[PDB]
């Protein structure tokens, strides 16, 4: 192969030199359940990185006059009473650089995917200040998630902090993986003003689930701009606590360098659980649901790194998509309440909607985005303006589905429109839609072109129509993409092509749609 098999080692032996620097030592006096108390280390600083004899690492987290209670970062069983603990003079820091794209790294920045090392451009402390009020800018650029429901009803603008919140197996990781996949078109442009770099932080997930997500991203082409900061359930509570901060630091390095980042925390509930475990093991006073007093701060300190920077700082942005698992759809629990308060908007996913087939299962109405239309392109803003009111009216009218003969003409029309809009917002997994396709699809429904298609066929009628437009009338898509608005001539062309397609469309019931 090459001489490097020896040469590298040579470079080490020629370059290696363990010099004799003075060091402050502590001694482990207690050790149990992932926490080690270290007597000594007079000059240790809070959240410092202590190194234990067996190559183990810990974070000096409680400092008393007697001992330093440190949370051990893995390999806890190798810690014993009387062991020597050396202090590294550095607060928690992680390497950061463009080399992390396509890599799976543990919360310390060390690769765990089995490939080579990562060439770090720099190091960032996990607890650096978030951008201040004066350093930010109004959220005004869309971050197309590719999910019609989110992009139409609760748009996410880069610089925003949108919470995907819902019970288990409701479609959250699916939504965030779809969002990551949707950025491939932006990535292939090569324009940093469009490129979105993704950081999927997995907290408390099993290794095979992280592997499944990585496979979904690779088969979708998203792994060339995505890093996976993985803290699998096998990892110590310290890693589950640090993983969001690791991912946030890796993203922040790009963000301050003019790039746009997309951070997915999945989940922050397990982050909170790991922090609770650490706090209770350190005997910090408990509160509601046993969480420490500063658990809110734990999440806030994190999510407030996700900001859009002013043009003086390069204009980069970091978008947060924390994922929270709500038990029995109880959004009033402690952590859900905290993160709903922190975040700028909420996609509430419900298992009832998932089973009804409303998957991706965003409960529109209850779901909100405080950034609003500022996070939408003009085409989607104008097309999807009436969508929310139509869906609200449909949910009001749903009790009348059996008496459509007895309702007013306008009410029955609203019911029929709403059913088709609901079918329109449905979307298959791992298949995000470009913003132009979403614009055309929502245009079909809001403008009434689906009013003739049967409900059960709407999903197909959309899917084919776009498949037609892309292949034959791409001028519409190109116009929407390049100009960001649905021009009148483009709208007329779109209506003409919709009508032409209607004639050739075979409804599943055998009827004709014109």
């Amino acid at each position: 192969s090459a001489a490097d098999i020896e040469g590298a080692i040579e470079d080490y032996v020629s370059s290696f030199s363990a010099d004799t620097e003075r060091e402050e030592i502590g001694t482990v006096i207690d050790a149990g359940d992932g926490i080690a108390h270290v007597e000594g280390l007079p000059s240790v600083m809070t959240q410092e990185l202590l190194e234990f004899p067996g190559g183990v690492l810990g974070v000096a987290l409680n400092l008393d006059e007697h001992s330093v209670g440190a949370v051990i970062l893995g390999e806890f069983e190798k810690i014993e009473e009387g062991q020597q603990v050396k202090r590294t003079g550095e607060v928690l820091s992680v390497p950061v650089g463009d080399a992390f794209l396509g890599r799976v790294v543990n919360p310390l920045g060390q690769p765990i995917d089995g490939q080579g090392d990562i060439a770090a451009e720099t190091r960032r402390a996990l607890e650096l200040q978030a951008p201040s009020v004066v350093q930010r800018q109004s959220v005004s650029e869309p971050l197309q998630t590719g999910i019609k429901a989110i992009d139409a009803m609760t748009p996410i603008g880069r610089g925003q902090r949108q919470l995907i919140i819902g019970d288990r197996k409701t479609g959250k990781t699916a939504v965030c993986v779809d969002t990551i996949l949707n950025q491939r078109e932006a990535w292939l442009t090569g324009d940093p003003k469009q490129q979105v770099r993704c950081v999927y932080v997995a907290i408390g997930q099993k290794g095979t689930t992280i592997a499944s997500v990585k496979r979904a991203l690779e088969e979708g082409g998203a792994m060339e701009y995505t890093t996976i900061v993985a803290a699998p359930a096998s990892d110590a509570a310290g890693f589950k606590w640090l993983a969001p901060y690791t991912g946030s630091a890796i993203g922040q390095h790009w963000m301050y360098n003019g790039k746009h980042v997309l951070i997915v925390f999945d989940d922050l509930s397990k982050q909170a659980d790991a922090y609770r475990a650490i706090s209770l093991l350190l005997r910090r006073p408990p509160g509601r649901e046993a969480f420490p007093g500063d658990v809110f701060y734990l999440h806030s300190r994190l999510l407030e790194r996700c900001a859009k920077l002013s043009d003086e700082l390069g204009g980069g942005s970091m978008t947060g998509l924390p994922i929270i698992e709500t038990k029995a759809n109880d959004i009033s629990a402690f952590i859900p309440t905290n993160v709903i308060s922190i975040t700028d908007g909420q996609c509430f996913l419900e298992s009832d909607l998932f089973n009804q087939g409303v998957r991706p299962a965003i409960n529109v109405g209850v779901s909100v985005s405080r950034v609003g239309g500022a996070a939408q392109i003009k085409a989607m803003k104008e097309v999807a303006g009436s969508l929310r009111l139509d869906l609200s009216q449909y949910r009001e009218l749903e009790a009348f589905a059996a008496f459509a003969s007895d309702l007013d003409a306008a009410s029955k029309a609203q019911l029929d429109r709403g059913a088709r809009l609901v079918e329109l917002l449905k979307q298959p997994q791992y298949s995000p839609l470009a913003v132009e396709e979403q614009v055309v699809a929502i245009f079909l429904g809001t403008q009434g072109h689906l009013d003739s298609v049967p409900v059960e066929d709407v999903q197909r009628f959309e899917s084919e129509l776009l498949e037609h437009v892309k292949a034959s009338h791409s001028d519409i898509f190109d116009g929407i993409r390049e100009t960001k608005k649905l021009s009148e001539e483009a709208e007329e062309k779109l209506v003409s092509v919709i009508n032409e397609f209607k004639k050739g469309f075979q409804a599943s019931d055998g009827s004709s749609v014109v």
């Binding site: 925003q160 701060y297 407030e304």
Partner: protein, 464 residues
Amino acid sequence: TAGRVVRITGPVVDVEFPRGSVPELFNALHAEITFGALAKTLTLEVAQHLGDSLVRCISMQPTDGLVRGVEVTDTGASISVPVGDGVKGHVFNALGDCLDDPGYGKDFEHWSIHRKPPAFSDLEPRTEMLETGLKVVDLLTPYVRGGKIALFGGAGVGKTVLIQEMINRIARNFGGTSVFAGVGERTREGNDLWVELADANVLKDTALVFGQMDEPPGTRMRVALSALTMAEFFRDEQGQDVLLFIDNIFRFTQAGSEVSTLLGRMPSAVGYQPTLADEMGELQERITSTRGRSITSMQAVYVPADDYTDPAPATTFAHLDATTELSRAVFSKGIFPAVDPLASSSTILDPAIVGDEHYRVAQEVIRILQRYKDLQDIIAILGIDELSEEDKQLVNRARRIERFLSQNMMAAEQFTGQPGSTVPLKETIEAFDKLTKGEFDHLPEQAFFLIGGLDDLAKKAESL
């Protein structure tokens, strides 16, 4: 003489002082984090005396990087905030540091944020209505001078536009000022508010005091007190009526709860701090009218689990004199300021504080609007034509009333150019008396949109 940090458990920092120099409670102490990446000057607020010359403090800034044995210097006074005309037009944090212009106000007069409420003999024994000039507020839910107003709402319901409107009205009609106490701000929302106020040119009449969410709970708990201290200086020294916004005073309660948990105090009923009512009282009692000048406050309130019996909202509402609820449904109908006439309420809408004519007209308007809200279901399902003639007449009158509750706000002047209207209370009362009696049921509905008073109604009708 200077203390030494002996314990650091997250935000909680214990400081050992020489026996003769233990700082008294709520004093601000300064510690230095010399680590390069996290270099800082921590402001620790003395919270307890533990004995043996130890004091337990809540760090107002993240304690990461703090080292045991680092010198802690006592300032000798509690957290002090700059006060004066200079605070107007600038954004401050809970500790009085200017965020948009660092080092600004460090040479102003500084006031401790821990001030007793007015003496009992100095309080105003009679509630006085605040004629803000908005038709909806002045008629349906009159505000209380020196009182507290809950501001229920959200995104896209014009809460920020209403805040701008009230800032303009307090600055222009009453010759007063405003202090925006951003407890638990989303830094994005805080920046948006700062730029909106600067663009509207009302920033010069408002002092912003943001305690962001990213800061530890000490600052989120003390920011309301800091902003209220600026408001108190304006009230007592400058002699100005003040308008203290507090978005969101649930945060303040929750920051108090988190601080209580950190200090080790046993949680109360629903996990709230045992002294919840006393903290809320110590905050709210200072918002009152004294010696002819008043601090009014519009305090956005979050209701956990939508449960008004929860300890936090239950304690908050013991002090709230009025309740303005902004509605998405009303906002979508073009009816700015977007106040829901039925969900909103006031505790001064009584025949005694307001005139009997005022109460009668307000109750008639409420009755009409409630009957219309009931008929909305029939209109939406069965159609307008399925109503009776009396029902159709009432529907027309209610449409016109609810559209006349809209107004050309001063905050909208920046968008359209039309000066905002300040409808006198008497004019609003007589105008709505005319509306409820059908004297204007023959004008088109578009005539009633965004117009202050009968003169504007007539002019717009003639313009259609």
